[PDB]
Amino acid sequence: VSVYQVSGTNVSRSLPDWIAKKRKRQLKNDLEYQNRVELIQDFEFSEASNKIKVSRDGQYCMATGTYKPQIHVYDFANLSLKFDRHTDAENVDFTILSDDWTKSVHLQNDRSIQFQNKGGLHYTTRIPKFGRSLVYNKVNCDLYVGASGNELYRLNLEKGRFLNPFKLDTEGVNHVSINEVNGLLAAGTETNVVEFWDPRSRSRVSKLYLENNIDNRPFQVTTTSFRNDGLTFACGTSNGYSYIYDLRTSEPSIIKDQGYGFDIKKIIWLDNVGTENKIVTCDKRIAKIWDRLDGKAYASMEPSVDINDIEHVPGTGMFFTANESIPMHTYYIPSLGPSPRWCSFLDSITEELEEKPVYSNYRFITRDDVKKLNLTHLVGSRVLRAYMHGFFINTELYDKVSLIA
């Protein structure tokens, strides 16, 4: 398939972003810069972007920045920045409670939860210990905040009161997710275990101990996600594998690795687009779309700069990603689905776009891991492809050798 980069850094990694613009000012004579198309004006954070989320209304977007730490809200109808609001500390996570941008809850890195309303900062509260994730239950009207401590703190917006926190067996919860159809909860502990809780009662239904035959090194559950249907569950391990679980069974339906060995930050189910059996798994380096049932890579999005988050506009082929660079990359896959309503004529200009292009399909090994895996004899053969410090490998063959070693 074909991936089009509508906006972002078209320059490679070693080239620094800031120099390019000054040299771009010198290169302003170039016709292409004049003819460049920008979907959203001021769609770039000052130095980097932490998180990006699209309002459920579909007509607004929100994002968080690095310096000065700030919140940008973009109006798709006007294709520009509605406003930017500075904050006292950087944002770890946030959620948009209302269908629009009006009400949102932001979890800062200074241990404080900040409630943002249309006019400004409505209220700020502090939790007992540092938080790493946040989620909101509509039915129960409670906001759940993971933290370094074992407790999973619980705040009720209806009563405006903190309540009894759920006591996790393990210390720490990297990510928390709630299942809309079911109400289940998941918590990603530092140890290789995911604990499921009930919001109706306050009880631990069960735990999954993630099992990795391929890799014996310790790992953490970085991210968790629930599919719309409600019987399927996705996990992300710090070592860099993604597990899809049918909740009724206790074994992984499929284990696909990104291959670079980096943490898995975000997992999205592309149920809206069509051919629901597609999932997105994102590292810092690469975010790849692959088929749920069979594990065949549909497409891949390799930005030059690292990825802090990826967000999918529902029902469309467009993706937004929060990156370390000044611009926020947005990728359009015409095959996956039609362009959003607001940018209707983006389809007409598909030729002009970059049309960016192996990394997703194949696995990558570090040089040290090659020596441990007894793959040195293979070195110098077709089975492996040299990429930079390490050498690529076929996914299945890696599993066999690691089982051997």
Partner: peptide, 30 residues
């Protein structure tokens, strides 16, 4: 210990009181 919020205080916090209203319909599943 209570200072800086390091202990958990369960008193009602007025500004966020009635911030959001629960959905009466409930979860989609019975």
């Amino acid at each position: 210990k209570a200072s800086k919020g390091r202990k958990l205080n369960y008193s009602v916090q007025d500004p966020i009181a009635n911030y959001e209203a629960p959905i009466t319909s409930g979860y989609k599943w019975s």
